[PDB]
Amino acid sequence: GIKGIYKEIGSGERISLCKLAIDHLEQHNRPLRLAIDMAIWQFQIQAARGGSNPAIRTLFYRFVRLLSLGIHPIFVFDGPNKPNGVSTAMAKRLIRLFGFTAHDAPGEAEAECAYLEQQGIVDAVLSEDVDTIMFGSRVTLRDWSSEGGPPTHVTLHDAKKIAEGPSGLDREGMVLVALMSGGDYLPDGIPGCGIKVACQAAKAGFGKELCAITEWKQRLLHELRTNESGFFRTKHKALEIPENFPNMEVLRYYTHPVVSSPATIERLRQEFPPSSTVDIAGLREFTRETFDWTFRPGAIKLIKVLAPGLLVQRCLDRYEESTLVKGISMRREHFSTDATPELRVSFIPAELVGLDPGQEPEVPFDPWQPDLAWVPETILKLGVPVTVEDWEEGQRS
Amino acid sequence: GIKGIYKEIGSGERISLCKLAIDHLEQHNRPLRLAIDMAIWQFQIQAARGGSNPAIRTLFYRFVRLLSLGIHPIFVFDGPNKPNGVSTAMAKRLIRLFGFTAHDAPGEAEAECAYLEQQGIVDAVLSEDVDTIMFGSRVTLRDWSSEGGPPTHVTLHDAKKIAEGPSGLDREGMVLVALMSGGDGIPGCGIKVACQAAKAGFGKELCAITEWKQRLLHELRTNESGFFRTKHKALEIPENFPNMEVLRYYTHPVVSSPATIERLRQEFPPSSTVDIAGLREFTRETFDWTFRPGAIKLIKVLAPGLLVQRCLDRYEESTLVKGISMRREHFSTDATPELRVSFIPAELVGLDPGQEPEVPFDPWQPDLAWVPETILKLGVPVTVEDWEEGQRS
DNA sequence: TCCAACCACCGCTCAACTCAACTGCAGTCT
DNA sequence: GACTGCAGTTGAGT
DNA sequence: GAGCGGTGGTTGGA
Ligand SMILES: [Mg+2]
Ligand SMILES: [Mg+2]
Numbered sequence: 066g067i068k069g070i071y072k073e074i075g076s077g078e079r080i081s082l083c084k085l086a087i088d089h090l091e092q093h094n095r096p097l098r099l100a101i102d103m104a105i106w107q108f109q110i111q112a113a114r115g116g117s118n119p120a121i122r123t124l125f126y127r128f129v130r131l132l133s134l135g136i137h138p139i140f141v142f143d144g145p146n147k148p149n150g151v152s153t154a155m156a157k158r159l160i161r162l163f164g165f166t167a168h169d170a171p172g173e174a175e176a177e178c179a180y181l182e183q184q185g186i187v188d189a190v191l192s193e194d195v196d197t198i199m200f201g202s203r204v205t206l207r208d209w210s211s212e213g214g215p216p217t218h219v220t221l222h223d224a225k226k227i228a229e230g231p232s233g234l235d236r237e238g239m240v241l242v243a244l245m246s247g248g249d250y251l252p253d254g255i256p257g258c259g260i261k262v263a264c265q266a267a268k269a270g271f272g273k274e275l276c277a278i279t280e281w282k283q284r285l286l287h288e289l290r291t292n293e294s295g296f297f298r299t300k301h302k303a304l305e306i307p308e309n310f311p312n313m314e315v316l317r318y319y320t321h322p323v324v325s326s327p328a329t330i331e332r333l334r335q336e337f338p339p340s341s342t343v344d345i346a347g348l349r350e351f352t353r354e355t356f357d358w359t360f361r362p363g364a365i366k367l368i369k370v371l372a373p374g375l376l377v378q379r380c381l382d383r384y385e386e387s388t389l390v391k392g393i394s395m396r397r398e399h400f401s402t403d404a405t406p407e408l409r410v411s412f413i414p415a416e417l418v419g420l421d422p423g424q425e426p427e428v429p430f431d432p433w434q435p436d437l438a439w440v441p442e443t444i445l446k447l448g449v450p451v452t453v454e455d456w457e458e459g460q461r462s
Numbered sequence: 463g464i465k466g467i468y469k470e471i472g473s474g475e476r477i478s479l480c481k482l483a484i485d486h487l488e489q490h491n492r493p494l495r496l497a498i499d500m501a502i503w504q505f506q507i508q509a510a511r512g513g514s515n516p517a518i519r520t521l522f523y524r525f526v527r528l529l530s531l532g533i534h535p536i537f538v539f540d541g542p543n544k545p546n547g548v549s550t551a552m553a554k555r556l557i558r559l560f561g562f563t564a565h566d567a568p569g570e571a572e573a574e575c576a577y578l579e580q581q582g583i584v585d586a587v588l589s590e591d592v593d594t595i596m597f598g599s600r601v602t603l604r605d606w607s608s609e610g611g612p613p614t615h616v617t618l619h620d621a622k623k624i625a626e627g628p629s630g631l632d633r634e635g636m637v638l639v640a641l642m643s644g645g646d647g648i649p650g651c652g653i654k655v656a657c658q659a660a661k662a663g664f665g666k667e668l669c670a671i672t673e674w675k676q677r678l679l680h681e682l683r684t685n686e687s688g689f690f691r692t693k694h695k696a697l698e699i700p701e702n703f704p705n706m707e708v709l710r711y712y713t714h715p716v717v718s719s720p721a722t723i724e725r726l727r728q729e730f731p732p733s734s735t736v737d738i739a740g741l742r743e744f745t746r747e748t749f750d751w752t753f754r755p756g757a758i759k760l761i762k763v764l765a766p767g768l769l770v771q772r773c774l775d776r777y778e779e780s781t782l783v784k785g786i787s788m789r790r791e792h793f794s795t796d797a798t799p800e801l802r803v804s805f806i807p808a809e810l811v812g813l814d815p816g817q818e819p820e821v822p823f824d825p826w827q828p829d830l831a832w833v834p835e836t837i838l839k840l841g842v843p844v845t846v847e848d849w850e851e852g853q854r855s
Numbered sequence: 856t857c858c859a860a861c862c863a864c865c866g867c868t869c870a871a872c873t874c875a876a877c878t879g880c881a882g883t884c885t
Numbered sequence: 886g887a888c889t890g891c892a893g894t895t896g897a898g899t
Numbered sequence: 900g901a902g903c904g905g906t907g908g909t910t911g912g913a
Contacts, residue, residue, distance in 0.1 A: 068879090068887075108885040108886085194886060207886090249879090257895085261877060298876075299896045463900065465863090505900075510871045512899040519899085520871055591900065604900095611893085612872080643863090650863070650909075691861085696909055749899095763873085788890090823874095 066250050067243060069260045070195060073232040077220040079212065081403035085219070086134045087441050089188060096381060098137045098338065100178040100187040102197075103156070105209070111149040117357040120151045121159065125352075128163045130216065132374025135381050135444055137338040139166040139187060146172040146323050148314070155355070162348050164341040164378075168333075176200040176322035186333050191219065198224050199239050199319050217401045237274050238267035240319045244311055253309030262289075262297060262304075269296035274316070282311065341382065343375060345419055361425040365432055368422070372414035373438040380440070380448030389417070390449045391435060393456035399439070406442040408456070411435045464639060466653050467592060470629040474617040476609065478796035482616075483531045484834045486585060493534045493774055495731065497575040499589040500539050500553065502606070508546050514750045517548050518556065522745075524606075525560045527613065529767025532774045532837055534731040536563040536584060543569040543716050545707075552748070559741050561734035561771075565726070573597040573715035581723050583730060588616070595621050596636045596712050614794045634667055635660035637712045646705035650697050655682075655690060662689040667709070675704065734775075736768060738812055754818040758825055761815070765807035766831040772810075773833070773841030782810070783842045784828060786849035789835070799835040801846070804828045 071077070089097040106124060113123045131138055140160055142153065157167045170177035178190045179200035189204040190197050197205045203224045212218040228235040234242070245263040248254035271285050288294055289301040325333075349367060352358040358366050380389060395409035415422065415432035422432060445453050468474070486494040503521060510516035528535055537557055539550065554564045567574035575587045576597035586601040587594050594602045600621040609615040625632035631639070635657075642648050642656040659665075664678050681687055682694040718726075742760055745751040751759050772782055788802035808814065808825035815825060838846050 066886080071887080111885090246878095257878075259878060301895085303895065465901085468901085505870050507871070509869095510899085514899095516871080516899075523872065608871095652863070654862070692910060694910085759873095790891090792892095 066194070066196065066247060067239070067260070068247060070239075070242075073260070073264055074195070074222070074227045074234055077207070077222045079218055080221050081212075081217055081401065081405065082136075082209065082219050083134060083217065083402040083441065084405050085189075085221075086136050087405050087443050090135065091443055093188075096135050096137050096338075097189070098187040099139070099206075100181045100190045101138050101140050102174045102178050102190070102192040103140050103142050104174060105191065105193050105207075106151070107149045109210075110151060118355050120149060121155055122356055124151065124156065125159060125356075126370070127216070128159065128165065129370055129374045131165070132163070132343070132371075133377050133440075135377050135441075137166075137341065139168050139181070139337060141174040141177050141181070142167065142169045143174045144169055144171040144177075148318055159351065162344045162351055164339065164343045166337055166339055171325060172323035177324050178202070179205075180322070180324040181330075181333070184330050186330065186337060195222050198222070198227070199236055199243065200322050201236060212401070215401075232264060233268045234264065235272070237272035238264070240274065240316070241267045241272045243319070244315065251312065251315050253307045253312035253315070255304065255306055255310065257301070257304040259304075262301065265297050269294070274320070276313075278311070278313075282306075341378065343371075343378060345371075349420060361422045361427050364420055364422045364425045365430060368414045368418045368420055368432045369430055369436075372412065372417050372432075372436065373440075376410070376412055376417055376438065377440060377444055380444055384447050385451070386449075387452065390445070390452050393445075393452060394437075396442070396460075397439065402441070407439040408442050408445055408453070410438050410440045410445065412438065463591065464593070464636070464643070464653065467636075467639075470653070470657055471592070471619070471624045471631055474604070474619045476615055477618050478609075478614060478794065478798065479533075479606065479616050480531055480614065480794075480834065481796040481798050482586075482618075483533050484795075484798050484836050487532065487774075487840075488836055490585075493532050493731075494586070495534045495584040496536070496603075497578045497584040497587045498535050498537050499571045499575055499587070500537050501571060501590050502588065503548065504546065507548065515748050518552055519749055521548070521553065522556065522749075523763070524613070525556065525562065526763055526767045528562070529560070529736070530770050530833075532770050532834075534563075534734070536565050536578070536730055538571040538574050538578075539564065539566045540571050541566055541568045545711055556744060559737045559744055561732065561736050563730055563732055568718060569716040574717050575599070576602075577715070577717040577723075578726070581727075583723065583726050592619050595619065595624070596633060596640065597715050598633060609794065612794075629657060630661045631657065632665070634665035634713075637709070638665045638667065640712065641704055641708065646700050646702035646708065648697055648699055648703060650694075652697075655694065655697075658690050662687070667704075669706075671704070671706075675699070734771075736764075736771060738764075742813060754815045754820045757813060757815040757818045758823060761807050761811045761813060761825045762823055762829075765805065765810050765825075765829065766833075769803070769805055769810060769831065770833060770837055773837045776841040778844060779842070780845070783838070783845050786838075786845060787830070789853075790832070792832070795834070800832040801835050801838055801849070802830055803833050803838065804830055 086097045110120045110123050113119045116122065140156075142157075160167045168177070175190075175192050175197050178187075178192060179197040179202040181187045182190050182203060183201045189206055190202050191206040191209060192202075194207060195202075195205055205222045205224070206219045207222070208218075208220045210216045210218065224236070228238075232238075242260060242263040243251060245255050245258045245266060246260050248256075248258070266285065266288075269288070271281075286306060288296050289304055289306075292300045348371065349364065352367050353363055357363070376389060383389075389412065391411045391413065393408050393410060397407055397409070398404040399407065412435065413433060414436050418432075442453070483494045507517040507520040510520045513519065537553075539554075557564045565574070565578075572589055572594050575584075575589055576594045576599035578584045579587050579600060580598045586603055587599045588603045588606060591604060592602055602619045602621070603616045604619070605617045607613045607615065621633070625635070629635075638660050639653060639656040642651050642659060643653050644651070659678055659681075662678070662681065664674070667674070678689075679699055681689050682697055685693045741764065742757065745760050746756055750756070769782060776782075782805065784804045784806065786801050786803055790800050790802070791797040792800065805828065806826060807829050811825075835846070
């Protein structure tokens, strides 16, 4: 589901997640909004030794990476109305602590994700696969990973470019494919079929699928048997077709998937994105209880990990004050960001995060000394414009 | 037929021809030797269609299959001393090009095949039916076919096990059945009754003759000893019966001379090198496998079997196998252990398609084939050991 | 007379393989 | 979920 | 050459 689909639509465009975030921020003058299917974690997350709760620990670092990218994420959870070891409660707790949004689909999350995109709530979808396209996604993302090392890239699929050849596969086309082929998921699918043949049926325009039904089935069946119109590579007489085909409690499951109410969509327009303020004291207590980051070493570990992303977040949110950036020392266009212009920024971690390791019991990295980080130039111009200008001025000299 | 013989002796054991070949090779430490009656081909190969000479083409592919099985075949042809649409000359020509042996019976091929087996020239007989048992065969094979696809299996009959119940049909038993059930054979008779006369010991017949005839004739009409299911006064028996010139057609069938048997004992199996250039010219002239495509076609089809022949004939040289990838015990071979070998077809066959006039399978790229582990251990032992030890890792 | 089981006999009917492309399976990592 | 070779099938031509 | 039902004939009994 759908097995062999990337042979037809393509594997997709590998692209820096940083580039997407910054390109969108430049074109639309606001941070990228992303719907993330919570199901993508199950196998990336588990397993990743060791220490205490390494599974949710990996989730923590992914969240910090989201902060540094300046993305407004909304995490969608599955609902009971469908036809690892990481607690949902803990996941949702960490989400809120990071100032992110948790959202519960009434049914399947991937359908809700696609729906949110269609309604303009989010700009793109990050999911397990491209099932989201069947539910109406236009820009869908998968495989958030290294390009190993740090997870910097995703694989982008565009529903409009896919529909424009060579597969000619659109939403209705893929629906027919799933309806005809596998089969191992949906009832009353065709035994000998078959993504190659199904895609050929879709390309022949059969993907309508406009609710009676009796006529369509026999035109399609006659074409399969005789290949008169030449819709297929060969004839297909041995391909006998179930009486429960086309199953239609399946059909709309795709064309009208159970998603949030219109009232819920309107609530989200007003309430998403949220204030997005990272709860520092909350994260300190969470990491202590969950990761055993206890005492002064645990506080310093938190500051080190959290300071860069928190720098980005406040830099975007705040839109005389070197309260964020102490200085700039270099410029680069690195391949990991697909040559996205970044500037080498210096900052004071402990001062930025706002925790004092002295208030913690004592049982190298000094959180009070300057630390360095690469931050996208675009983000820096928005938050610390005067600092960026001074650097630009010094470079002209 | 003998008609309805199989409901008496059993339908036979269906067995992988590969299993027979490899089992015999493991037990006797030399390839299986098989006598093949050329009469089997008549109503099997004329179902092929398309192309040039599809019947002799079918014969070609089965010859290639014989190479892959590592079997040493001797094809027996009929002779004139007996009491569609394939040329004998072309059949014999192709046989020699493959390094196989062609043998002319002085009379019926079946009798000669059985005789060859009795004399130790071959280990088993492949023929149309089971008549070979009457001529003295002990292990006889029939119906070399699919188990619907490639012809991997055969039906084995064992003369010893047949004679050991429940039919009790031995050689002289089946002779009596043949004598009685027509057709100077007895009208109204009768394999059920004939087989019952056999179990009553009447199959001897060791000659004068008049006493014997009047015992079963008295038993047929009275059933005193209970030899039969019922009485049989209906059956009246011809004066000529039992026909004696028929009896020794079975007990002493016209076959090759002792001198010929001795000739075969030292000449078979033969040197047996596949004539590559010969086959190239044959397939060009007969199948219209012309120019570079025809060369490539030959190389692809012939490379695997040719690999086996080298393997067994071996009995460092990576000139056969480039590597091993996997192990399997497939049902088509009756779980005969096979290894997935890689080889270069063109390099192995030894023909360059470049010397042919050109007009997607690349014969210079590695190709894969399943080859019986036993054969591989014999021909390329060092390669097999490297695979075995990398495995236990 | 007739049936019923058994049987010999008649008339009827059938008889491969390559090749490419494909689906589906079972590994596997995640 | 998706990738890889194997296996078995089908359709078309040999 | 072999598997299928039908046919007609023989045998021993109803
Ligand atoms: Mg999915
Ligand atoms: Mg015969």
